[PDB]
Design a protein around this ligand. Structure first.
Ligand SMILES: CC(=O)NCC(=O)N1[C@@H]2CC[C@H]1c1ccc(Nc3ncc(C(F)(F)F)c(NC4CCC4)n3)cc12
Ligand SMILES: [Cl-]
Ligand SMILES: [Cl-]
Length: 258
């Protein structure tokens, strides 16, 4: 087994529909990697395209400081193993859930830092003619003196001739749900705004119903802590019902707020 031959397993760090992920030491270099163990996707299936989407994306992108690195992938028995960069801070979803536990929270200054860092990852992805299409806190990772990294590229597709697999409906822009795949970079912007809203302590986001449509009409979820009215205004226009009104990642990362 390549897995046990060249890695030593330290700790299971996650499980779910995605399979399970283990923190491991690679014996040769002594470095830490997050290895994902999934059922071998059925050939010709959705899961296979997800996995080849992920391969293509990292091959296009290569290494970037705000993207979780992708090292190798192989099969053993009826499972697929993926070797990724290990981010010692977990996902933003873990950090949020931790904030509820200890009654802490991300201040405006930290929320701005989160927006800028992920914005730069998006800036790079979009500059390479790709879109991520599943931005959300559980796909943002933390290396700790803090680096935010975009992970799980299974939904990445090309701006020209896209193959869209819709992301989590809680973070999905209305126009994508309407099968309008013509301004997809602004779908990432929309989902990043709501990702930051979650980080700010907002209540869990709706999957459907009155509240869902109210957000897609441009109404920002209520945030308990106090933010400058202009930072609030920035998040608002990132969820503007008109995608062309939302700032591009390029515009977002050259935006004035530091
Ligand atoms: C004793 C100990 O070390 N515990 C720490 C722990 O359990 N962790 C730390 C902090 C919360 C949780 C946790 C989850 C994930 C990571 N890191 C990580 N890095 C890369 C990936 C990557 F696979 F995307 F690359 C990844 N995937 C998550 C696991 C569920 C999906 N997680 C780190 C941690
Ligand atoms: Cl098996
Ligand atoms: Cl098994």
């Amino acid at each position: 087994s390549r897995y046990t031959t060249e890695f030593h397993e330290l700790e299971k760090i996650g499980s779910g529909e995605f399979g399970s992920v283990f923190k491991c030491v690679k014996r040769l270099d002594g470095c830490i990697y997050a290895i994902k163990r999934s059922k071998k996707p059925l050939a010709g299936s959705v899961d296979e395209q997800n996995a080849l989407r992920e391969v293509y994306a990292h091959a296009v992108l290569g290494q970037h400081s705000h993207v979780v690195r992708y090292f190798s992938a192989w099969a053993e028995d009826d499972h697929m193993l993926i070797q990724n960069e290990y981010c010692n801070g977990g996902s933003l979803a873990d950090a949020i859930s931790e904030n509820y536990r200890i009654m802490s929270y991300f201040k405006e200054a930290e929320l701005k830092d989160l927006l800028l860092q992920v914005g730069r990852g998006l800036r790079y992805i979009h500059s390479m003619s790709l879109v991520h299409m599943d931005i959300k806190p559980s796909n943002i990772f933390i290396s700790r003196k803090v680096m935010f990294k975009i992970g799980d590229l299974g939904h990445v597709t090309r701006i020209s001739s896209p193959q869209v697999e819709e992301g989590d409906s809680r973070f999905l822009a209305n126009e994508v749900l309407q099968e309008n795949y013509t301004h997809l970079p602004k779908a990432d912007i929309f989902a990043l705004a709501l990702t930051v809203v979650c980080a700010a302590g907002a209540e869990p986001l709706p999957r459907n119903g009155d509240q869902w449509h109210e957000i897609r009409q441009g109404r920002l979820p209520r945030i308990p802590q106090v933010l400058s009215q202009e930072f609030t205004e920035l998040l608002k226009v990132m969820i503007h019902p008109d995608p062309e009104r939302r700032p591009s990642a390029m515009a977002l990362v050259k935006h004035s707020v530091l």
